[PDB]
Amino acid sequence: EPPRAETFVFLDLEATGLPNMDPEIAEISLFAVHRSSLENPERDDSLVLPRVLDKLTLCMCPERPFTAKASEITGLSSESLMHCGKAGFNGAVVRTLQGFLSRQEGPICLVAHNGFDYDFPLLCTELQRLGAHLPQDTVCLDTLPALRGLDRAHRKSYSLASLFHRYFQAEPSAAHSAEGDVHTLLLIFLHRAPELLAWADEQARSWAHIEPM
Amino acid sequence: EPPRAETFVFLDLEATGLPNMDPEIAEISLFAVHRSSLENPERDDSGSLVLPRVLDKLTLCMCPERPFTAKASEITGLSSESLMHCGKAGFNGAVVRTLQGFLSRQEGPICLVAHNGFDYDFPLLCTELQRLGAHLPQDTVCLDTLPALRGLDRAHSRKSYSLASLFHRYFQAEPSAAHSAEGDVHTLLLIFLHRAPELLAWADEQARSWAHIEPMYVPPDGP
Ligand SMILES: Nc1ccn([C@H]2C[C@H](O)[C@@H](COP(=O)(O)O)O2)c(=O)n1
Ligand SMILES: Nc1ccn([C@H]2C[C@H](O)[C@@H](COP(=O)(O)O)O2)c(=O)n1
Ligand SMILES: [Ca+2]
Ligand SMILES: [Ca+2]
Ligand SMILES: [Ca+2]
Ligand SMILES: [Mg+2]
Ligand SMILES: [Mg+2]
Ligand SMILES: [Mg+2]
Ligand SMILES: [Mg+2]
């Protein structure tokens, strides 16, 4: 039913708190990977990331300061980002993100762990706030209900750390940083690429159907 | 003479060959680091250098109009066909919008940093930008760490000053993901951090205006 995506843009967000705290994006990271790299993963002797990998990471000072929980987790604070001269989520962010996505062969499928409940509606809120739009044929995939569902067909924790520890028998790094989490998500995805690509070809939700937080 | 830069944007290019073949950018990577992260390089409890937490990054692959040389392709692990297979267009408007937006997110003035930048990266980037009629912010300056580190060793008185040699000399280990844009910038940033006080001082004194950078070659045409 959804359009067959050609590029999968894995993304992750660090923000100032949980959804009902009206959180602001402090960090966003995106790894763009063409479908063909996911269909036929490279392995040295273990998974290695695709050679052709467009990447974007941007830090931003939120207008609302962090929570203690969020700050210690992400290793970021409103003061820290200001000190490094980062402005908030503004037109410059939109122009860079839109440019980055236009560099990708469409249709695009955004991928995020627990995206339906957090990343997607938060990004939508920020984009809508600036009256910005994504390409019309853009869809999105939440690997959280997707992985749970795929396992039903065959109690376990489905946190990003639990999954990585389960598939690769090791600890992820650098956790709770936007770029680090996308890196972790991409490896997890690669480990289950055929099933997840299949999931996306059917269950991927239209970005237009994502409502602001 | 030069302005005091607030953001140091470390950049690396992968391209189809050496200057005399009129190479084209196939990959670009930029790490943006605020001066404060360089003035006081943060170090873990083990005392070893770690990359700044607040670190904007941009890596983009693109299919050049002309293909790679045997060497260039073998080095970078890139090829025209592989870039095409991953549906990457060439250095176009979308690259400029992304690049210019990325730089606009940085507190200026900006100092571009590249290893062998004067002889390769800066002229090549200038050629590609002129092709699309794109400009960087006027107050932008640039730093070549190759003559900088040579000059510093000459000052605080043969050795190779290649990226690999310097990383080996300063960190005594093999650099990971060598000859990839993002990998080489990562290597460059660590080298810079190893001697940040000196290089910052060098930048404040001898950083060249980007406006003085000449194109590696006059591009054929368009758009
Ligand atoms: N128990 C938690 C965990 C995370 N967060 C916030 C901080 C993070 O910026 C964001 C989740 O990002 P991530 O899952 O990548 O750590 O939500 C929160 O408010 N409470
Ligand atoms: N002996 C060399 C050194 C460099 N290059 C080209 C390939 C790279 O795309 C670009 C930058 O080199 P490097 O990856 O080593 O930084 O110059 C080349 O063709 N032959
Ligand atoms: Ca703006
Ligand atoms: Ca274990
Ligand atoms: Ca070199
Ligand atoms: Mg997240
Ligand atoms: Mg995260
Ligand atoms: Mg180089
Ligand atoms: Mg390089």
Author numbering:
A (entry chain B): 3 to 47, 50 to 158, 167 to 225
B (entry chain A): 3 to 159, 167 to 232
From the article:
In order to understand the non-processive mechanism of TREX2 in DNA processing, we determined mTREX2–product complex. In the complex, the input substrate DNA is degraded into single nucleotides by mTREX2 during crystallization. The final structure includes the mTREX2 dimer with two magnesium ions (MgA and MgB) and one product, deoxycytidine monophosphate (dCMP), per active site. MgA and MgB adopt a classic hexa-coordination pattern and a non-canonical penta-coordination pattern, respectively. The orientation of magnesium ions, dCMP and active site residues are consistent with the structures of other DEDDh exonuclease in complex with products, such as TREX1–product complex. According to the structural comparison of the substrate complex, mTREX2-Y-shaped DNA complex, the scissile phosphate and general base are shifted; specifically, the scissile phosphate is moved into the narrow groove in the active site. Hence, the product (dCMP) cannot be released from the narrow groove in the active site and the cleaved DNA substrate cannot be further processed by TREX2. Therefore, the cleaved DNA substrate should be released before the product; in the other words, the DNA substrate cannot be continuously processed by TREX2. In addition, the structure of mTREX2–product complex demonstrates the narrow groove in the active site limits the product releasing (nucleoside monophosphate); thus, the cleaved DNA substrate should be released before the product, which provides the structural evidence for the non-processive property of TREX2.
